[PDB]
Design a protein around this motif. Structure first.
Motif, PDB file in Angstrom:
ATOM      1  N   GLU A 240       0.793  -1.222   0.000  1.00  0.00           N
ATOM      2  CA  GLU A 240       0.000   0.000   0.000  1.00  0.00           C
ATOM      3  C   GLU A 240       0.839   1.293   0.000  1.00  0.00           C
ATOM      4  O   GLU A 240       0.389   2.313  -0.485  1.00  0.00           O
ATOM      5  N   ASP A 245       6.265  -1.818  -5.585  1.00  0.00           N
ATOM      6  CA  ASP A 245       6.344  -1.359  -6.957  1.00  0.00           C
ATOM      7  C   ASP A 245       7.613  -0.540  -7.222  1.00  0.00           C
ATOM      8  O   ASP A 245       8.250  -0.689  -8.263  1.00  0.00           O
TER       9      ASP A 245
ATOM     10  N   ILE B  89      -8.037  -7.320  -0.150  1.00  0.00           N
ATOM     11  CA  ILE B  89      -7.163  -7.642   0.972  1.00  0.00           C
ATOM     12  C   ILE B  89      -6.393  -6.366   1.276  1.00  0.00           C
ATOM     13  O   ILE B  89      -5.597  -5.896   0.442  1.00  0.00           O
ATOM     14  N   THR B  90      -6.656  -5.770   2.435  1.00  0.00           N
ATOM     15  CA  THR B  90      -5.982  -4.508   2.779  1.00  0.00           C
ATOM     16  C   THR B  90      -5.416  -4.608   4.172  1.00  0.00           C
ATOM     17  O   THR B  90      -5.847  -5.432   4.974  1.00  0.00           O
ATOM     18  N   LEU B  91      -4.440  -3.758   4.451  1.00  0.00           N
ATOM     19  CA  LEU B  91      -3.805  -3.761   5.764  1.00  0.00           C
ATOM     20  C   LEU B  91      -4.809  -3.618   6.916  1.00  0.00           C
ATOM     21  O   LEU B  91      -4.833  -4.453   7.819  1.00  0.00           O
ATOM     22  N   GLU B  94      -6.939  -6.797   7.283  1.00  0.00           N
ATOM     23  CA  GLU B  94      -6.200  -7.974   7.737  1.00  0.00           C
ATOM     24  C   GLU B  94      -5.793  -7.859   9.209  1.00  0.00           C
ATOM     25  O   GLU B  94      -5.451  -8.863   9.841  1.00  0.00           O
ATOM     26  N   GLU B  95      -5.813  -6.639   9.762  1.00  0.00           N
ATOM     27  CA  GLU B  95      -5.533  -6.499  11.178  1.00  0.00           C
ATOM     28  C   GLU B  95      -6.690  -7.051  11.982  1.00  0.00           C
ATOM     29  O   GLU B  95      -6.511  -7.384  13.136  1.00  0.00           O
ATOM     30  N   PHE B  99      -7.618 -13.427   5.881  1.00  0.00           N
ATOM     31  CA  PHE B  99      -7.923 -13.624   4.476  1.00  0.00           C
ATOM     32  C   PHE B  99      -7.170 -14.828   3.961  1.00  0.00           C
ATOM     33  O   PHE B  99      -6.046 -15.080   4.383  1.00  0.00           O
ATOM     34  N   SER B 100      -7.741 -15.516   2.981  1.00  0.00           N
ATOM     35  CA  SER B 100      -6.973 -16.453   2.175  1.00  0.00           C
ATOM     36  C   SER B 100      -5.967 -15.725   1.258  1.00  0.00           C
ATOM     37  O   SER B 100      -6.014 -14.495   1.087  1.00  0.00           O
ATOM     38  N   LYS B 101      -5.057 -16.479   0.652  1.00  0.00           N
ATOM     39  CA  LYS B 101      -4.293 -15.938  -0.441  1.00  0.00           C
ATOM     40  C   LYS B 101      -5.330 -15.534  -1.501  1.00  0.00           C
ATOM     41  O   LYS B 101      -6.458 -16.048  -1.499  1.00  0.00           O
ATOM     42  N   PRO B 102      -4.979 -14.567  -2.348  1.00  0.00           N
ATOM     43  CA  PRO B 102      -5.943 -13.979  -3.283  1.00  0.00           C
ATOM     44  C   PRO B 102      -6.503 -15.003  -4.267  1.00  0.00           C
ATOM     45  O   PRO B 102      -5.734 -15.811  -4.771  1.00  0.00           O
ATOM     46  N   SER B 105      -6.668 -11.384  -8.958  1.00  0.00           N
ATOM     47  CA  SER B 105      -5.834 -10.174  -8.967  1.00  0.00           C
ATOM     48  C   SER B 105      -6.527  -8.970  -9.612  1.00  0.00           C
ATOM     49  O   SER B 105      -7.307  -9.133 -10.521  1.00  0.00           O
ATOM     50  N   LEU B 212      -2.480   0.466 -12.273  1.00  0.00           N
ATOM     51  CA  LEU B 212      -1.661   1.482 -11.599  1.00  0.00           C
ATOM     52  C   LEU B 212      -1.066   0.973 -10.296  1.00  0.00           C
ATOM     53  O   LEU B 212      -0.085   1.538  -9.775  1.00  0.00           O
ATOM     54  N   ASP B 213      -1.706  -0.048  -9.741  1.00  0.00           N
ATOM     55  CA  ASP B 213      -1.219  -0.706  -8.531  1.00  0.00           C
ATOM     56  C   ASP B 213      -1.636  -2.190  -8.638  1.00  0.00           C
ATOM     57  O   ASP B 213      -2.080  -2.624  -9.701  1.00  0.00           O
ATOM     58  N   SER B 214      -1.435  -2.957  -7.580  1.00  0.00           N
ATOM     59  CA  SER B 214      -1.810  -4.372  -7.603  1.00  0.00           C
ATOM     60  C   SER B 214      -2.361  -4.760  -6.248  1.00  0.00           C
ATOM     61  O   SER B 214      -1.790  -4.414  -5.181  1.00  0.00           O
ATOM     62  N   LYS B 215      -3.530  -5.387  -6.311  1.00  0.00           N
ATOM     63  CA  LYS B 215      -4.246  -5.877  -5.126  1.00  0.00           C
ATOM     64  C   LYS B 215      -4.862  -7.250  -5.436  1.00  0.00           C
ATOM     65  O   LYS B 215      -4.756  -7.758  -6.561  1.00  0.00           O
TER      66      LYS B 215
END
Ligand SMILES: N#Cc1cc2c(cc1[N+](=O)[O-])=NC(=O)C(=O)N=2
Ligand SMILES: N#Cc1cc2c(cc1[N+](=O)[O-])=NC(=O)C(=O)N=2
Ligand SMILES: [Zn+2]
Ligand SMILES: [Zn+2]
Ligand SMILES: [Zn+2]
Ligand SMILES: [Zn+2]
Lengths: 258, 258
Positions: A240, A245, B89-91, B94-95, B99-102, B105, B212-215
Motif C-alpha cells: 500500500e 512497486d 485484501i488490505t492492511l 487484515e488487522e 484472508f486467504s491468499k488472493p 488479482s 496502476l497498482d496491484s491488489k
C-alpha cells in the motif's frame, strides 16, 4: 536475538555486490529481496542475518525420502527462521510452512529471440517451424501436461513428442537456447524472469503475449513462528505504501541495460 | 453445523437468477462467487447458507465510532462465518480478520468511452480536455493523494481542484458519467469491474493502460476461525487446477455481450 533469513542467489533478488570481497555480513549483498528484507525487518522490529541457501534450491519434497530440500527444508528442519526470496506460493509448500500474502505476482510467459514471428501462445500452437519448450520438470511443464484448454493441450501434444527434445535442464539453459537458436526456439518461463532478461545485455530477447496462468511469491515462515503475523502485515503495508512497486521498478528498469 | 456465508450483490460475483422468486435458499443466486462458494464448501467439507450482507457494504471502520460495517463487520462482530466475495485484501482489514491468499488479482485502471484518445495514465496526466476522477472517498482516491510518483502526483493535483467535481458517489455513477460525457470523462476503478463493463452492452467502454497498482480479493474468516486453514489451501488448489481462471473466463467472457 538475530533472525536468520534464508534466501537464494537469483538476480535481481539477491546478487553479490561488485566489491563484495571488501564488505561483510548483510552488506555483501544487494538486490530486490535484500531491500525487501531490510524493510520487513525495520517494520517488524528485528535484527537479522542473511544467509544463502546451502543447496541453492527453492524447496521440493523428495518422493523417495519425503525430505524437503532448499529454503523450505531450511525452515522445516530449523536451519533458518524466515525465507525472503522469490519463493512461489504453492499448496504443497503451504502444508508445511506459512506464507505471507504475495509480494510479487507472476505467470507463465513466452520468451523469444527478437525478430521471431510469434506474439502469443496461440501463434506458437499453430506451427512447428519455431520449436518451443519448458524446464524438463517443475510446475510449468505440469501446467501444460494437465491443461484441458485447447491451445495448451495442442502445445503439450507437440512438446511432449518433439525431437530433439524441447525441454531444458535449467532456466539458464532455456534462455541460452533462445539466444543461440537463430529465432528457432521460444522458451516458456516465469514472467518475472522473462521481463528481467529482456532488460539485460545483449538485449536480444523479448517477452510476448499475456501470462498463461497466475501465481505469487510470498515470504515464508515455519508454522507457529512468532514472526508470521507481523511479516504478513508488513508485506501489506509495503504494498500500500507503493514500496513493492518502487523496488520492482528499481531493479528491473532503473538498473535496466536496454 | 451450517456455515453462514456473507456475500454481496456485485455482478458478476453474485446476482439474482432471472427466476429467483420461483426458487429458494442458495439456488436464488448465481455468479462467479456462487460457483466459488460451492467449490470451497466441497473441498473444506461443509454445508453453507449464502446470505446477502445487511448493509450492502464491503467493510470499513467508521473514524468516529470505530465500528466496522459491511461484510468485514459481519465477520468481526460474529454474524457470519466466512465472506466469499470480491473483498479486497488490505492492511486495516487484515488487522481484524483473516484472508486467504488472493483468488483474483486486480488494480486501479482507466475506463474510457470508445474512441477516447487516451491510452495510459501518463496520457491523462499530460492533458486537461478529458476530465478524470475516482470514487469520492476510499482507496483509489487515497492512492492518488499519497502517491510519491510524478505522473500520479500530477493527476492528484488536477483531480483535487477540478471544477466541477470529478469524483463520484458510486461505481454506477462513474460508469454512467463516462457513457454520457461523449469522451470527456475517464473513470478510475478496479480493473475487474472495468473489464466486466467492457463486455456488457452497449459495448461502449474500454479498459486502457496497465494497472496502476496491484491488489487481490480474498475469502475472509474471523480471526482464529477453524475454517481459515482449510479455505486457504482450497484457494491454492483451485488456482493450481486452473479452476479460478476457468471461472473468470466463464463469467466475464463466455457470458460477455461484446
Ligand atoms: N527462473 C526462475 C524461478 C524458478 C522458481 C522460483 C523463482 C524463479 N525466479 O523468478 O528466478 N521460485 C520458486 O519457488 C521455484 O520453485 N522456482
Ligand atoms: N466496483 C467495485 C468494487 C469495489 C470494491 C470491491 C470490489 C469491487 N468490484 O470489482 O466489484 N471490493 C472491496 O473490498 C472494496 O472495498 N471495494
Ligand atoms: Zn569474489
Ligand atoms: Zn518503509
Ligand atoms: Zn427480481
Ligand atoms: Zn473442484
Amino acid at each position: 536475538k538475530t533472525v536468520v533469513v534464508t534466501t537464494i542467489l537469483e538476480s535481481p533478488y539477491v546478487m553479490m555486490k561488485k566489491n563484495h570481497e571488501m564488505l561483510e555480513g548483510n552488506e555483501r549483498y544487494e538486490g530486490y529481496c535484500v531491500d525487501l528484507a531490510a524493510e520487513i525487518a525495520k517494520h517488524c522490529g528485528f535484527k537479522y542475518k542473511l544467509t544463502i541457501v546451502g543447496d541453492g534450491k527453492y524447496g521440493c519434497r523428495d518422493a523417495d525420502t519425503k525430505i524437503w530440500n532448499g529454503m523450505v527444508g531450511e525452515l522445516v528442519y530449523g536451519k533458518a527462521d524466515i525465507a525472503i526470496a522469490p519463493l512461489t506460493i504453492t499448496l504443497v509448500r503451504e502444508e508445511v510452512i506459512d506464507f505471507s500474502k504475495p509480494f510479487m505476482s507472476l505467470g507463465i510467459s513466452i520468451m523469444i529471440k527478437k525478430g521471431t514471428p510469434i506474439e502469443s501462445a496461440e501463434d506458437l500452437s499453430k506451427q512447428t517451424e519455431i520449436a518451443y519448450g519448458t524446464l524438463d520438470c517443475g510446475s510449468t511443464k505440469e501446467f501444460f501436461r494437465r491443461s484441458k484448454i485447447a491451445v495448451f493441450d495442442k502445445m503439450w501434444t507437440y512438446m511432449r513428442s518433439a525431437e530433439p527434445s524441447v525441454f531444458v535442464r535449467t532456466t539458464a539453459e532455456g534462455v541460452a537456447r533462445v539466444r543461440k537458436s537463430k529465432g528457432k526456439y521460444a522458451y516458456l518461463l516465469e514472467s518475472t524472469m522473462n521481463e528481467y532478461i529482456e532488460q539485460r545485455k545483449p538485449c536480444d530477447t523479448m517477452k510476448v503475449g499475456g501470462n498463461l496462468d497466475s501465481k505469487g511469491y510470498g515470504i515464508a515462515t515455519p508454522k507457529g513462528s512468532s514472526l508470521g503475523n507481523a511479516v504478513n502485515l508488513a508485506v501489506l503495508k509495503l504494498n500500500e505504501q507503493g514500496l513493492l512497486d518502487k523496488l520492482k521498478n528499481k531493479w528491473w528498469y532503473d538498473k535496466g541495460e536496454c
